[PDB]
Amino acid sequence: ALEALNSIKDGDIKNLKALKKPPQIITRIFDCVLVLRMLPVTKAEYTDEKGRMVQVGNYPEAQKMMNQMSFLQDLKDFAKEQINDETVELLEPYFMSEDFTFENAQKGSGNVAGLCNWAESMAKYHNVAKVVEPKIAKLREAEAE
Amino acid sequence: MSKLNDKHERVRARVREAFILFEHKEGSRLVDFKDVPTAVRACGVNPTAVQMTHILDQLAALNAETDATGYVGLENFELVVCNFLIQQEASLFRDDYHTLLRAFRAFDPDGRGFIDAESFKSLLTGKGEALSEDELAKMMTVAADGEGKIWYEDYAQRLANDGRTI
Amino acid sequence: ERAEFEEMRETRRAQAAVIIQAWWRGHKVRMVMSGGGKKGAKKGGAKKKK
Amino acid sequence: AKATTIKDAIRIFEERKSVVATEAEKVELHGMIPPIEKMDATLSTLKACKHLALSTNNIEKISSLSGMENLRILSLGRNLIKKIENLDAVADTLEELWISYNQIASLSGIEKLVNLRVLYMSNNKITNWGEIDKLAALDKLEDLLLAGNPLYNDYKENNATSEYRIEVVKRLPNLKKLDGMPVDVDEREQANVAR
Numbered sequence: 001a002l003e004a005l006n007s008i009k010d011g012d013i014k015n016l017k018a019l020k021k022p023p024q025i026i027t028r029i030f031d032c033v034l035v036l037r038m039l040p041v042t043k044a045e046y047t048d049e050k051g052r053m054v055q056v057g058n059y060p061e062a063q064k065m066m067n068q069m070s071f072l073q074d075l076k077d078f079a080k081e082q083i084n085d086e087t088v089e090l091l092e093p094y095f096m097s098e099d100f101t102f103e104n105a106q107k108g109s110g111n112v113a114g115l116c117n118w119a120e121s122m123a124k125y126h127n128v129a130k131v132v133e134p135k136i137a138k139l140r141e142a143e144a145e
Numbered sequence: 146m147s148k149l150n151d152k153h154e155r156v157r158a159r160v161r162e163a164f165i166l167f168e169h170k171e172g173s174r175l176v177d178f179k180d181v182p183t184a185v186r187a188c189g190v191n192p193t194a195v196q197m198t199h200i201l202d203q204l205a206a207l208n209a210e211t212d213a214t215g216y217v218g219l220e221n222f223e224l225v226v227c228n229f230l231i232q233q234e235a236s237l238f239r240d241d242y243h244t245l246l247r248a249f250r251a252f253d254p255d256g257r258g259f260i261d262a263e264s265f266k267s268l269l270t271g272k273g274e275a276l277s278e279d280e281l282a283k284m285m286t287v288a289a290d291g292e293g294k295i296w297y298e299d300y301a302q303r304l305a306n307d308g309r310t311i
Numbered sequence: 312e313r314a315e316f317e318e319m320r321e322t323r324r325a326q327a328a329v330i331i332q333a334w335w336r337g338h339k340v341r342m343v344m345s346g347g348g349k350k351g352a353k354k355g356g357a358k359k360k361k
Numbered sequence: 362a363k364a365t366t367i368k369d370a371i372r373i374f375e376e377r378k379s380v381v382a383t384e385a386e387k388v389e390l391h392g393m394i395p396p397i398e399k400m401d402a403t404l405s406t407l408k409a410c411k412h413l414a415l416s417t418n419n420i421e422k423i424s425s426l427s428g429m430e431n432l433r434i435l436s437l438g439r440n441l442i443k444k445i446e447n448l449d450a451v452a453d454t455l456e457e458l459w460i461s462y463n464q465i466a467s468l469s470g471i472e473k474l475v476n477l478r479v480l481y482m483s484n485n486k487i488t489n490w491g492e493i494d495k496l497a498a499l500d501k502l503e504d505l506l507l508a509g510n511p512l513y514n515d516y517k518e519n520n521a522t523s524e525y526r527i528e529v530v531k532r533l534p535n536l537k538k539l540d541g542m543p544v545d546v547d548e549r550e551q552a553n554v555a556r
Contacts (some may be wrong), residue, residue: 040484040509043439043462045419052479053362053394055417055439082541085481086461086506089416089438093392166344183340191337193329210467211488245334251327273328284335287342304334307341 001121001128010093013071015111021063024032024049024056025099026112031057034053034065034118037074047110056096075118081133084126091123153227160223160230163188175216178204188226189309191241194274200225242305249297252293259294364398364419371403387412391436399427407432416440416459426450438462445470452476461485461506468492477502483540484509493532504538505529529556 016022018052022030024047031041093098105116167176168183176184181204182197192200207221237244252260252268265288266281288295365373366490370390371382382388388410390397396416405428407413413432417439426432427450435451436459441465448455457479466486471477478501487510489492496502507513507529516525530536530544530552537544 017513038483038508040514041462043441050362053396055396055469083479085459085479086438086458089391089414089436089459092389092414093394093417096392096394115373182336183343186337186340187344191334193333195329196333210469225321241334248327248334249331251323268324269328269332272325274332276332280339283339287339304338308345309337309341 001125002078005078005118006119008075008118009072012075012111012114012118016066016115019066019109022108024059026108026115027057027059027062028054028094029100029105029112029116029119030062032091032100033115033121033122035090036084036119036122038086039065048121052097052099054099078122078125080129082126082129084130089128099117119128156227156230157223160188160226161219163226164219164222169216173216173224174219175214176219176222178215178217181217181222184222185226185229188230189311190230196229200229239311242301245301246298246303249301253297258298259296262289262293262295265295362395363391365395366399367397367401367403369393370397370415374483382407382410384409386410386431387414389410389414391416391418393418402428404428420494433457435459448473456501458482460511466492468495470487472498473494474499475501477506481506483507483513486510487512490528490532493529496533500535502533503536505533505536506540508540527551 017032035041036131041061042058043055045055047056100116100119102113102116105112153186164174164176164184167180169175169177178201181201185192185200203225204217204221208217211218213275249260252254252265262285266285269276269284270278270281282307288300290296367390370393371388373393374385374389375382378385378389383406388407391414394429397420400420400423402425404425405415409428409431411431412430412434412505413429414436415436416436419436421441421443423437423442423445424447424465426435426447428504429451432451433453433454433553434454434457438459438461440460440463443466445460445465445468452473452475454476455474456476458474459481461481462484462528463482464486465482466488467486468499471480473499474480474554477499477533478503480496481504483506485507487507489512493507493512496505511524516522526539526544526548530548534549534556535551
């Protein structure tokens with residue numbers, strides 16, 4: 001999962017910059033990655049569409065956060081012993097829905113598939129670290145005993 | 146109910162008009178805390194020292210939840226003044242002249258019709274809501290005549306007719 | 312009866328003093344307001360040409 | 362298609378996980394379709410619930426937390442909660458509170474969570490250090506997250522993240538982790554000398 005993050009250092013940034021205001025269907029997963037990065041978002045049914053009933057991302061927030069040059073550091077700087085409690089709290093409805101499928105992601109463009117793969121890899125990393133923490137605690141207790 | 150809501154709207158308009166008179170800035174919807182004892186008396190009521198202290202404490206408690214800028218919000222001041230005025234009208238009926246006449250008669254056991262100004266000043270200085278010497282001098286200036294006799298009937302009539310428009 | 316009267320007269324006088332002081336406060340504030348804002352009218356410059 | 366009741370959320374969670382809500386330690390009624398708008402007393406049946414997740418909904422007020430004797434984790438993020446209140450029912454067993462991103466500007470009442478250990482309420486409406494000063498009453502608080510608040514952003518845009526962390530550690534000398542980064546001994550010393 002970690003090696004899948006640094007390989008997307010600049011191609012996704014360039015493609016998203018040239019994407020020219022993408023629609024909300026992939027703005028949803030873009031804001032998913034944004035919440036994983038833990039940046040402020042407004043919380044309401046903004047531009048809500050009937051049929052999904054999911055917290056679809058806003059229109060101008062994606063444009064505001066697209067031109068930021070810090071995305072390379074966002075996709076690079078991370079460490080262990082993380083809980084990602086806020087992200088696992090706010091990312092449930094996107095897992096409940098079925099609009100993040102790989103087949104749906106590849107329909108848009110190459111950057112969509114890479115961003116979805118990055119989000120999935122980071123979620124798997126968070127889950128595996130959450131499993132690891134009590135395990136390593138038990139290992140150190142057993143070593144002391 | 147609709148009638149209750151309309152009456153509340155009228156009371157809101159009246160209390161907003163009263164609040165605007167003590168605004169620190171025009172349209173700021175804020176009143177200085179030091180003028181709150183002066184502003185509460187402006188609404189046709191006569192709060193006691195205990196009542197004003199309770200109003201100040203309630204306003205401070207309400208403003209503790211918001212930014213402590215030293216100014217009282219229009220909504221909070223309006224709610225507090227509305228509650229106090231409604232309670233005063235409900236309990237103390239508007240027989241203000243008779244209430245003040247009884248209060249003044251409490252100081253005249255013999256029913257002579259007049260009360261000594263120096264004794265009045267001493268009693269108000271030592272008893273009840275102890276007031277300042279400037280305030281006492283204002284009392285003698287307003288009430289006492291050239292002979293030093295305070296006709297409590299006329300003084301109570303003047304006190305009750307203090308421009309309070311119902 | 313004398314003890315009761317001695318207590319009652321003092322309590323009544325204290326209550327009357329409190330009431331009259333509060334009502335005088337209100338009357339004083341209302342006299343101050345009735346002394347309306349006769350602010351000094353600043354004589355603005357009378358521009359003649361335009 | 363306006364709001365989801367607690368009973369509807371319970372039935373959906375039971376359909377998803379094939380487990381009874383009353384017997385499940387981790388109850389997941391969060392992210393319902395449509396989002397839940399009101400929190401009611403049906404949740405009192407979750408006696409064995411240690412992880413209640415009602416987050417990402419349209420809940421505006423916190424209420425009806427009674428009946429959950431074993432409640433250790435409460436998740437209420439991405440909601441319309443503005444005030445910390447009605448936490449006395451589960452204050453004895455609650456250790457982590459997940460109320461991040463909310464519209465909370467005042468931290469009155471958080472002192473009721475005497476047993477709170479993890480408090481993630483980042484991206485809220487905190488604009489003054491007085492709210493952070495209210496967190497000093499939490500003796501067991503070891504982790505705090507406040508990234509995205511106006512107070513945090515004021516230092517972040519001015520490149521004063523270190524000063525923000527020093528102030529946070531000064532007001533909470535026993536804090537172990539801040540914004541996902543453990544508090545180091547140098548930061549502790551700077552907070553001590555500033556205090």
